Amino acid sequence: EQFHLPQPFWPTTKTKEGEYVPKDSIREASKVFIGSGVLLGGMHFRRLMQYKKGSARPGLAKYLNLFSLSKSQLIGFPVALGAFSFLSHSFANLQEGQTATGEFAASSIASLIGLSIFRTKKPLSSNVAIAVGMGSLFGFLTWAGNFNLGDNSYRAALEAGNGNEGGFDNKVIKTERQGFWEGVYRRPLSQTVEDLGEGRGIITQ
Amino acid sequence: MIASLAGWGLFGVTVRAYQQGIRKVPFSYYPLGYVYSALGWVAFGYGFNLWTERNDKLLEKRVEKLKESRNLRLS
Amino acid sequence: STADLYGLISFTPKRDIHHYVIRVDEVPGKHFPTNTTGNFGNTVDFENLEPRRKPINPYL
Amino acid sequence: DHVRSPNVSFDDIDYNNSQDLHNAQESLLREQWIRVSALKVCRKALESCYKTSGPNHYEDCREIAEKYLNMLPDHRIQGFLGYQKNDPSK
Amino acid sequence: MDLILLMLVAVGLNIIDIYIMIEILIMGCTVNTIYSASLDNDMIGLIYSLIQIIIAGVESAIGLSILVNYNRIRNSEEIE
Amino acid sequence: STFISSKLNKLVFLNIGFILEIIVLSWLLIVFKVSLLKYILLLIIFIIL
Amino acid sequence: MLVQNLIIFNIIGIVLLVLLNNNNNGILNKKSLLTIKNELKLKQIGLIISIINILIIIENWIGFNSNYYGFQNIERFLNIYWGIDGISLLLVLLTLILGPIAILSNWKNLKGYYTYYVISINMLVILMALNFICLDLVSFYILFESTLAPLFLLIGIYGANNKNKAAYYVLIYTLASSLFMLLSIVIYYIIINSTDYIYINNIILSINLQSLLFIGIIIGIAVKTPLMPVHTWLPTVHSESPLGGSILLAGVILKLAIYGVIRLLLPNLSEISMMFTPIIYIISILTLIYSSLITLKQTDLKVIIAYSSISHLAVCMIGIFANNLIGINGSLILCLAHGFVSPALFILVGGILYDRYHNRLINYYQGLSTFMPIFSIYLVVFSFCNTGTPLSGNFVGEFLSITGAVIRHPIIGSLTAASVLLSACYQMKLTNRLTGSVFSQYLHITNDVTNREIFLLNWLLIPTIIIGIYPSFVTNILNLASSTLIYSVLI
Amino acid sequence: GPHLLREDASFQRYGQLRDNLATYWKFNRKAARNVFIFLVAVPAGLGYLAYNYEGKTPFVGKRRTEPIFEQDYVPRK
Numbered sequence A: 001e002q003f004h005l006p007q008p009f010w011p012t013t014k015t016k017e018g019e020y021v022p023k024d025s026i027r028e029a030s031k032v033f034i035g036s037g038v039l040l041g042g043m044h045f046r047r048l049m050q051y052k053k054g055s056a057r058p059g060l061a062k063y064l065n066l067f068s069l070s071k072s073q074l075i076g077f078p079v080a081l082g083a084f085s086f087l088s089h090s091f092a093n094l095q096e097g098q099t100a101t102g103e104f105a106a107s108s109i110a111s112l113i114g115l116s117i118f119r120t121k122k123p124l125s126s127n128v129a130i131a132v133g134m135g136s137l138f139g140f141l142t143w144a145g146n147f148n149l150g151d152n153s154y155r156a157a158l159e160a161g162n163g164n165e166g167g168f169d170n171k172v173i174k175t176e177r178q179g180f181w182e183g184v185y186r187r188p189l190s191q192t193v194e195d196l197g198e199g200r201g202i203i204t205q
Numbered sequence B: 001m002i003a004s005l006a007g008w009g010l011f012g013v014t015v016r017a018y019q020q021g022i023r024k025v026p027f028s029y030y031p032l033g034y035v036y037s038a039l040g041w042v043a044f045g046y047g048f049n050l051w052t053e054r055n056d057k058l059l060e061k062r063v064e065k066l067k068e069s070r071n072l073r074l075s
Numbered sequence C: 001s002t003a004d005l006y007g008l009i010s011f012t013p014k015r016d017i018h019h020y021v022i023r024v025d026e027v028p029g030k031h032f033p034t035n036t037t038g039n040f041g042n043t044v045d046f047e048n049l050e051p052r053r054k055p056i057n058p059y060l
Numbered sequence D: 001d002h003v004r005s006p007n008v009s010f011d012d013i014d015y016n017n018s019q020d021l022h023n024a025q026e027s028l029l030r031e032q033w034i035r036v037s038a039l040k041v042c043r044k045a046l047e048s049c050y051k052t053s054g055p056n057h058y059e060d061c062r063e064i065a066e067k068y069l070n071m072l073p074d075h076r077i078q079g080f081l082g083y084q085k086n087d088p089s090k
Numbered sequence E: 001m002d003l004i005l006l007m008l009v010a011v012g013l014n015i016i017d018i019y020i021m022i023e024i025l026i027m028g029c030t031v032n033t034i035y036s037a038s039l040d041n042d043m044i045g046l047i048y049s050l051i052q053i054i055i056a057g058v059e060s061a062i063g064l065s066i067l068v069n070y071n072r073i074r075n076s077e078e079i080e
Numbered sequence F: 001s002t003f004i005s006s007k008l009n010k011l012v013f014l015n016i017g018f019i020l021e022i023i024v025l026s027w028l029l030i031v032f033k034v035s036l037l038k039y040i041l042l043l044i045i046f047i048i049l
Numbered sequence G: 001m002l003v004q005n006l007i008i009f010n011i012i013g014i015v016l017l018v019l020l021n022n023n024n025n026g027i028l029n030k031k032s033l034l035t036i037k038n039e040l041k042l043k044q045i046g047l048i049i050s051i052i053n054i055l056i057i058i059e060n061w062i063g064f065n066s067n068y069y070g071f072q073n074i075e076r077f078l079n080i081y082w083g084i085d086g087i088s089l090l091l092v093l094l095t096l097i098l099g100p101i102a103i104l105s106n107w108k109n110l111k112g113y114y115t116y117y118v119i120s121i122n123m124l125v126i127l128m129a130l131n132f133i134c135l136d137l138v139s140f141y142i143l144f145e146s147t148l149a150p151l152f153l154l155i156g157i158y159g160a161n162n163k164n165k166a167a168y169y170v171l172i173y174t175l176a177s178s179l180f181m182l183l184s185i186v187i188y189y190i191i192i193n194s195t196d197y198i199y200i201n202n203i204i205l206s207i208n209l210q211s212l213l214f215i216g217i218i219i220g221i222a223v224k225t226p227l228m229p230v231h232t233w234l235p236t237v238h239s240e241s242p243l244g245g246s247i248l249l250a251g252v253i254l255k256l257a258i259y260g261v262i263r264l265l266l267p268n269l270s271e272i273s274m275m276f277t278p279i280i281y282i283i284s285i286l287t288l289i290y291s292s293l294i295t296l297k298q299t300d301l302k303v304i305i306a307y308s309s310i311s312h313l314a315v316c317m318i319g320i321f322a323n324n325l326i327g328i329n330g331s332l333i334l335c336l337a338h339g340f341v342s343p344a345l346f347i348l349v350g351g352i353l354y355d356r357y358h359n360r361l362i363n364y365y366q367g368l369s370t371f372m373p374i375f376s377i378y379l380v381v382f383s384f385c386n387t388g389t390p391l392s393g394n395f396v397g398e399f400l401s402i403t404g405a406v407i408r409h410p411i412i413g414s415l416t417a418a419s420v421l422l423s424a425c426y427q428m429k430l431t432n433r434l435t436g437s438v439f440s441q442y443l444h445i446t447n448d449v450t451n452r453e454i455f456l457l458n459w460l461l462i463p464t465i466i467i468g469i470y471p472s473f474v475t476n477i478l479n480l481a482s483s484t485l486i487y488s489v490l491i
Numbered sequence H: 001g002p003h004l005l006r007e008d009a010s011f012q013r014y015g016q017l018r019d020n021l022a023t024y025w026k027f028n029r030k031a032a033r034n035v036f037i038f039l040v041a042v043p044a045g046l047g048y049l050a051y052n053y054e055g056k057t058p059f060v061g062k063r064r065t066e067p068i069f070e071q072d073y074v075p076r077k
């Protein structure tokens, strides 16, 4: 018998058992790593031609220097994203679906792999603090429901008959649990016991 | 309905009273000023109530159609 | 009553590529600047034109 | 004056009628406060017996002590949110 | 190739060189419209192209006027 | 905030080359598939450092 | 009547005070009569309005019925429905009573601009008083956040050496968190299409959606009643704000967060409140034990009282989340009793000592019972009340809150009993040091407590000991109101 | 008023330091040793006891169903 704790999670599209064909974790990271390497590598050479055309000009070198990537960054960035895409997809298959802790785990490690390359001359604690910080942002970005809840938004539930457009009533009790956005006047007591558990005033004293 | 224009006018007195402080003048300066600022907002207050009463008539009729549409949805 | 009225107004009907408002009140091509009858591909007849979809005024 | 409780149950009314729902909540509160008042009376009977019996308090105050320890868990204010929002039958 | 932003190497290092790139960029839009309009035998596309050429001219004149006054503003001693 | 704002202040400077380059980069958001947004979100966070 | 008379009169009073003071500004220098004696006439009109505000509510207290369940005195003003029930009535009474006392505390210890101060104090009191008598989450939030605008300016203008740090703390801590309370209020308006108290009390939500709304709201509450680890704003603001700002920020503002539980969590989120109550106890018990231990290592006089405020409010939250009438009534009596004892200490520490020696460091003060005996009688008397001595109103609140805590959870709720011991550690150490050994060699003999400062003390002690000796005055109002908050199904 | 307090230069430094310990604080291995104990170790330990017994203690009016005293005596001698 386990404990009863709250579940503060936004609704998600549940995948039926047997759904969720996994995606190639090697191939997916290969596209991002190779692709990002050519862009960052290609833009570097393009910015080198702009350096040759104008060097004595102060404003031109003022802006070109901002975009310049150190030799470590031109290598560290593609590796991190390639590591990020591999770990993000791999943890998606292990969980049978993308989760916040998977995205936290992928983002923090991938940052640590990347940060240890283009930020060598900094204490390892300084990197782990940054990598854990960047982990939280992807944990919260996934927990919040990506950029949009999509089908789980109240608008979608309302447009599907699962919203509170229909009012409430005490004489109509639903044996099954109500939807995420749905409200009711009265509930089956078995749902309260299966949530609160017996004890401190529920059923018994 | 005069009481509604009474409140709007009293808001007109406050703006002229609040104008005196910004200009840093005694609040009894140019007593005809309070009449002009009062009447200006009664003109606005008169029109504003006309606009809101017009909104009530329009919104009652629109809700008549929205209630019917919900019933078709709630079938 | 306020909760009812807001529930009516705040609701947004679903729009797909099947139902949406298009504000065209007539079929073009009745008269052209010149050579109105081209390759005779204008199968639309304006003498027996079916009624168009007039817009709904929800305040009327 | 002494207002009569509006004896009303959650199981016979429509919660859409928030006037009747109010009475169902007010009626379930008032009955509970009676049980505490009933409980405080029973405890008074126990106290007289123990003071009066002395050594015989275990005998002359046997069923009162038994009854008081039986009514104690349930003769307390519990509110109406428990029963309004839950359905024992289901 | 142009995904590495090669066109930035092809634009000179003067304000007047930016103005020309804007014209060459818009010129591509008009040529695209003339291409579609002629294939479709549609004169409405040719009306659009005529407007684009006329509007692209007014944009040049205002930009040059700002640039001209920008230039004389520095050379504004005129105390002789 | 002192670290973040010190980076953002360095970016606001009157320069045609800078603003033109930023705009053309943003055309990539129309080319890349939308599933690559989070990687661009990480790449942006890196160049802060 | 009530709110309409309470707003219209106060607005009229605020306009009247502004007209009188600013008339002479003009283009010429002015030496008028209203400036004489440090704006004394304008301070008096501010003090009368505070007294009149109390008379407005009493006009409606007479009509109150203790045997009626439901909101009374219901009225609609500004398209907002108001009303009073048992719990709200007493907190309104406390808020308005601290009006005259907050103004009287700062009678002659500001460098100037007394009219601005008097207007702000009466403005903050009205905003907080109105916060107990609204009947929707949106209007609750509006009044819950509007107090930042005067309080932020008041602390910045009239504060101590670190007033800029204190101003930047109250504004951001209490806004970056209450904005999380706005999100859960908004979601109530999206699914239910209404935020009215009664309408939302009857709806049950999915246990996942209950957990989200609770987390949002309790984030906004855990800052106002500072629970570790987000309490860092209160000690700083107290040590720097004006003395009158400290009386309101401790007397009332903290109790708005306990009233936040009564309206926003227990009735409508009853199922998820049961789940979080074990977690709430863990946070509050650790708040009780850590705040008491941290106080043992503090040096500023006015900070030391600030942390004592946190330990009591943790006990209040412990009691209110107990699912019985004993815990709820005890928590509310403690909030009322703390509402007088806490302001009294700041008067003793930041209002009587600080107005004579202008230094809050503890090292300078000892042996104060020699040349300031009347001060040391009240410091001793209020030290005991602050630590739950049985004859005060704090013991009734703490004993019941501890009793209710054990009833709800016998094992961990018993650790609330550490409040009786720890509260006597940091407090009695402070009093024993202040009134012990020889008189300090850094201070100079001066006046004892003045007649005004005695009046402030006597009328914060008198209500405290009435509630202690006969707490049934509070209870007879609370019982039917507090019995609607209990969630339990017994079969 | 008249500065009735003989202000001390050393007490002011002590008061200045004690109200500004945040500036000199570092997140060294010592702080993490303390930070882990107070923010995680204690809350989890109590958090387990709170949830373990949450509902397992029906102590209201608990009754006795087992004798206290012993009946027969079994001497060693």
Ligand SMILES: CCCCCCCCCCCCCCCCCC(=O)OC[C@H](COP(=O)(O)OCCN)OC(=O)CCCCCCCCCCCCCCCCC
Binding pocket: A031, A032, A034, A035, A036, A037, A038, A039, A042, E001, E003, E004, F025, F026, F028, F029, F031, F032, F033, F036, F039, F040, F043
């Ligand atoms: C003859 C060829 C000439 C040269 C060709 C190569 C040109 C050099 C440019 C680099 C190549 C990569 C970019 C090429 C176009 C962008 C990629 C694209 O269009 O999407 C296709 C590809 C995956 O496509 P796919 O999912 O298989 O589509 C079928 C689905 N059933 O999407 C991909 O994932 C491919 C890899 C792209 C990932 C790299 C970018 C990831 C993020 C790094 C940041 C890049 C810079 C950020 C700037 C953002 C500014 C806001």
Ligand SMILES: CCCCCCCCCCCCCCCCCC(=O)OC[C@H](COP(=O)(O)OCCN)OC(=O)CCCCCCCCCCCCCCCCC
Binding pocket: A065, A066, A067, A068, A069, A070, A137, A138, A141, F007, F008, F010, F011, F022, F025, F041, F044, F045, F047, F048, F049
């Ligand atoms: C592929 C080409 C290269 C990458 C281009 C990326 C284009 C998209 C960027 C969008 C914002 C435009 C920023 C303006 C252009 C910045 C160009 C740049 O990188 O300049 C470098 C600058 C700091 O320069 P510095 O490091 O001091 O000098 C380098 C010495 N070699 O570094 C910066 O100042 C960049 C940081 C600017 C602010 C970006 C932060 C955006 C917010 C992202 C975090 C959002 C977090 C929200 C939380 C929930 C989501 C996780």
Ligand SMILES: CCCCCCCCCCCC(=O)OC[C@H](COP(=O)(O)OCC[N+](C)(C)C)OC(=O)CCCCCCCCCCC
Binding pocket: B003, B004, B005, B007, B008, B010, B011, B014, B017, B018, G011, G015, G018, G078, G079
């Ligand atoms: C130095 C001074 C400091 C401040 C002092 C306080 C001054 C208070 C003044 C009292 C005035 C009064 O009583 O206003 C009463 C009048 C009329 O009310 P009614 O007829 O019931 O209309 C219905 C009002 N309901 C809903 C309360 C019933 O409303 C007003 O004019 C409203 C003020 C104008 C607000 C701006 C909205 C209009 C512009 C729209 C562009 C966005």
Ligand SMILES: CCCCCCCCCCCC(=O)OC[C@H](COP(=O)(O)OCC[N+](C)(C)C)OC(=O)CCCCCCCCCCC
Binding pocket: B021, G010, G011, G014, G017, G018, G021, G022, G025, G113, G114, G115, G116, G117, G119, G120, G123, G126, G146, G149, G150, G153
């Ligand atoms: C119940 C709600 C009513 C609404 C009140 C609105 C405030 C506007 C008052 C203007 C009067 C004025 O500008 O006058 C100024 C007055 C009095 O200044 P003084 O000390 O006499 O003059 C000083 C100069 N001398 C002495 C040299 C002559 O100070 C005030 O303003 C105080 C109250 C407002 C401060 C906080 C405003 C925050 C607004 C947002 C709140 C949600």
